[PDB]
Motif scaffolding. Structure first.
Motif, PDB file in Angstrom:
ATOM      1  N   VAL A  95      75.476  42.344 106.991  1.00 48.78           N
ATOM      2  CA  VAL A  95      75.190  43.140 105.916  1.00 48.78           C
ATOM      3  C   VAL A  95      73.939  43.540 106.069  1.00 48.78           C
ATOM      4  N   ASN A  96      73.155  42.318 106.815  1.00 48.33           N
ATOM      5  CA  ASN A  96      71.513  43.208 107.572  1.00 48.33           C
ATOM      6  C   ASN A  96      71.052  42.998 108.693  1.00 48.33           C
ATOM      7  N   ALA A  97      72.210  43.505 109.365  1.00 45.82           N
ATOM      8  CA  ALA A  97      71.890  43.954 110.578  1.00 45.82           C
ATOM      9  C   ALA A  97      70.761  44.886 110.575  1.00 45.82           C
ATOM     10  N   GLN A  98      69.683  44.393 112.186  1.00 48.98           N
ATOM     11  CA  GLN A  98      69.079  45.447 112.623  1.00 48.98           C
ATOM     12  C   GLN A  98      69.198  45.957 113.826  1.00 48.98           C
ATOM     13  N   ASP A  99      68.748  47.323 113.653  1.00 52.47           N
ATOM     14  CA  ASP A  99      69.312  47.923 115.013  1.00 52.47           C
ATOM     15  C   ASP A  99      67.642  48.064 115.642  1.00 52.47           C
ATOM     16  N   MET A 100      67.934  48.555 117.364  1.00 52.93           N
ATOM     17  CA  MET A 100      66.731  48.998 118.053  1.00 52.93           C
ATOM     18  C   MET A 100      65.297  48.827 117.447  1.00 52.93           C
ATOM     19  N   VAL A 101      65.067  49.844 116.065  1.00 51.67           N
ATOM     20  CA  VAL A 101      63.815  50.124 115.761  1.00 51.67           C
ATOM     21  C   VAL A 101      63.910  49.104 114.516  1.00 51.67           C
ATOM     22  N   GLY A 102      64.469  48.435 114.102  1.00 53.19           N
ATOM     23  CA  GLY A 102      63.993  46.976 113.326  1.00 53.19           C
ATOM     24  C   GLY A 102      65.294  47.736 111.880  1.00 53.19           C
ATOM     25  N   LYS A 103      65.929  48.921 111.610  1.00 52.95           N
ATOM     26  CA  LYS A 103      66.696  49.571 110.822  1.00 52.95           C
ATOM     27  C   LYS A 103      68.112  48.645 110.037  1.00 52.95           C
ATOM     28  N   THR A 104      68.389  48.590 109.169  1.00 54.36           N
ATOM     29  CA  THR A 104      69.457  48.052 108.181  1.00 54.36           C
ATOM     30  C   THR A 104      70.162  48.874 107.914  1.00 54.36           C
ATOM     31  N   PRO A 105      71.800  48.728 107.416  1.00 53.43           N
ATOM     32  CA  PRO A 105      72.381  49.230 106.912  1.00 53.43           C
ATOM     33  C   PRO A 105      72.230  50.128 105.675  1.00 53.43           C
ATOM     34  N   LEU A 106      71.249  49.046 104.806  1.00 54.41           N
ATOM     35  CA  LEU A 106      70.391  49.397 103.371  1.00 54.41           C
ATOM     36  C   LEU A 106      69.601  51.070 103.561  1.00 54.41           C
ATOM     37  N   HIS A 107      69.149  50.643 105.228  1.00 59.34           N
ATOM     38  CA  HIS A 107      67.680  52.250 105.266  1.00 59.34           C
ATOM     39  C   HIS A 107      68.455  53.292 105.767  1.00 59.34           C
ATOM     40  N   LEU A 108      69.677  53.371 106.129  1.00 63.76           N
ATOM     41  CA  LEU A 108      70.246  54.130 106.206  1.00 63.76           C
ATOM     42  C   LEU A 108      71.472  55.470 105.362  1.00 63.76           C
ATOM     43  N   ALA A 109      71.662  53.748 104.680  1.00 60.53           N
ATOM     44  CA  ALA A 109      72.340  54.508 103.477  1.00 60.53           C
ATOM     45  C   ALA A 109      71.073  54.924 102.402  1.00 60.53           C
ATOM     46  N   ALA A 110      69.997  53.993 102.134  1.00 60.95           N
ATOM     47  CA  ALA A 110      69.229  54.681 101.094  1.00 60.95           C
ATOM     48  C   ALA A 110      68.427  56.625 101.937  1.00 60.95           C
ATOM     49  N   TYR A 111      68.113  56.735 102.896  1.00 66.41           N
ATOM     50  CA  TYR A 111      68.098  57.884 103.976  1.00 66.41           C
ATOM     51  C   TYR A 111      69.103  58.569 103.811  1.00 66.41           C
ATOM     52  N   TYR A 112      69.656  58.869 104.229  1.00 64.57           N
ATOM     53  CA  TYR A 112      70.988  59.736 103.770  1.00 64.57           C
ATOM     54  C   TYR A 112      71.844  59.757 102.959  1.00 64.57           C
ATOM     55  N   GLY A 113      71.282  59.633 101.916  1.00 66.35           N
ATOM     56  CA  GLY A 113      72.018  59.655 100.549  1.00 66.35           C
ATOM     57  C   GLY A 113      73.490  58.995 100.152  1.00 66.35           C
ATOM     58  N   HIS A 114      73.530  58.011 100.487  1.00 69.41           N
ATOM     59  CA  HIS A 114      75.255  57.405 100.251  1.00 69.41           C
ATOM     60  C   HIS A 114      74.599  56.475  98.745  1.00 69.41           C
ATOM     61  N   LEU A 115      74.477  56.503  97.065  1.00 69.72           N
ATOM     62  CA  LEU A 115      74.292  55.989  96.238  1.00 69.72           C
ATOM     63  C   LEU A 115      75.200  54.516  96.412  1.00 69.72           C
ATOM     64  N   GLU A 116      76.958  54.711  96.263  1.00 72.43           N
ATOM     65  CA  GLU A 116      77.909  53.620  96.180  1.00 72.43           C
ATOM     66  C   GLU A 116      77.772  53.342  97.150  1.00 72.43           C
ATOM     67  N   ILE A 117      77.732  53.632  98.627  1.00 71.90           N
ATOM     68  CA  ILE A 117      77.019  52.598  99.862  1.00 71.90           C
ATOM     69  C   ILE A 117      76.017  52.069  99.405  1.00 71.90           C
ATOM     70  N   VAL A 118      74.584  52.320  98.953  1.00 71.99           N
ATOM     71  CA  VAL A 118      73.530  51.643  98.369  1.00 71.99           C
ATOM     72  C   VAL A 118      74.776  50.059  97.360  1.00 71.99           C
TER      73      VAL A 118
END
Length: 163
Positions: A95-118
Motif C-alpha cells: 500500500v505504501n510502495a514508492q516510485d522513483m520520486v517517492g510517490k505512493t499510491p495514495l499520492h496518485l489517488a489524491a492528485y488524480y481525484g479518486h476519492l473511493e480509492i483514497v
C-alpha cells in the motif's frame, strides 16, 4: 520470450481469451516490456479486471516495479480502477510502495481525484504523511489540484493519526 511479448500485448489490449491461451502455453506471467512493465502493470493500468484476477491467481508478482518504480497498485490508483485496487491489495500489494520520486499510491489517488480509492488505501494502512522527493504529502497534492473532498478525508485521517 515471444510468448511473454504476446502476453504483454494481450494484457494491454484487454484480450481475455488471448491472455489465457498464452498463459496455458507457458507465457512468463512476469514478462517485462521496454519500460519494465508486466502484464499485471498493463492490465491494472488499463482497467482490465479479469486479466488482473487471472494473473494474480496464477502467481504473478503483485509488487513488481517498472523502470519508473511504479507498481500495479500505483497504476490502478492513477486511472481510478477501484475494484482492481481492492483485488491488488487482497493479493498483497504494498500500500505504501514508492516510485522513483517517492510517490505512493495514495499520492496518485489524491492528485488524480479518486476519492473511493483514497479511502480504501487509508483503510489498508496508507501513510497519510508520506512525502515524495519534493516534500509533498498526498494532502498537499489534493490541495494543489483543488480536490477538496479528498483533502478533507486526508485531514480526517491525519487528525486521527495525530491523536
Amino acid at each position: 520470450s515471444d510468448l511473454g511479448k504476446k502476453l504483454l500485448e494481450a494484457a494491454r489490449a484487454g484480450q481475455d481469451d488471448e491472455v489465457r491461451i498464452l498463459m496455458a502455453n507457458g507465457a512468463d506471467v512476469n514478462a517485462t516490456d521496454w519500460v519494465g512493465m508486466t502484464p499485471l502493470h498493463l492490465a491494472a493500468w488499463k482497467g482490465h479486471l479479469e486479466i488482473v484476477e487471472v494473473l494474480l491467481k496464477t502467481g504473478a508478482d503483485v509488487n513488481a516495479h517498472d523502470v519508473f518504480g511504479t507498481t500495479p497498485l500505483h497504476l490502478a490508483a492513477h486511472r481510478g480502477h477501484l475494484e482492481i485496487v481492492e483485488v491488488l491489495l487482497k493479493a498483497g500489494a504494498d500500500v505504501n510502495a514508492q516510485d522513483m520520486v517517492g510517490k505512493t499510491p495514495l499520492h496518485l489517488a489524491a492528485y488524480y481525484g479518486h476519492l473511493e480509492i483514497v479511502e480504501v488505501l487509508l483503510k489498508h494502512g496508507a501513510d497519510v504523511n508520506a512525502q515524495d522527493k519534493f516534500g509533498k504529502t498526498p494532502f498537499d497534492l489534493a490541495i494543489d489540484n483543488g480536490n477538496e473532498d479528498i483533502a478533507e478525508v486526508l485531514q480526517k485521517a491525519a487528525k486521527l493519526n495525530d491523536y
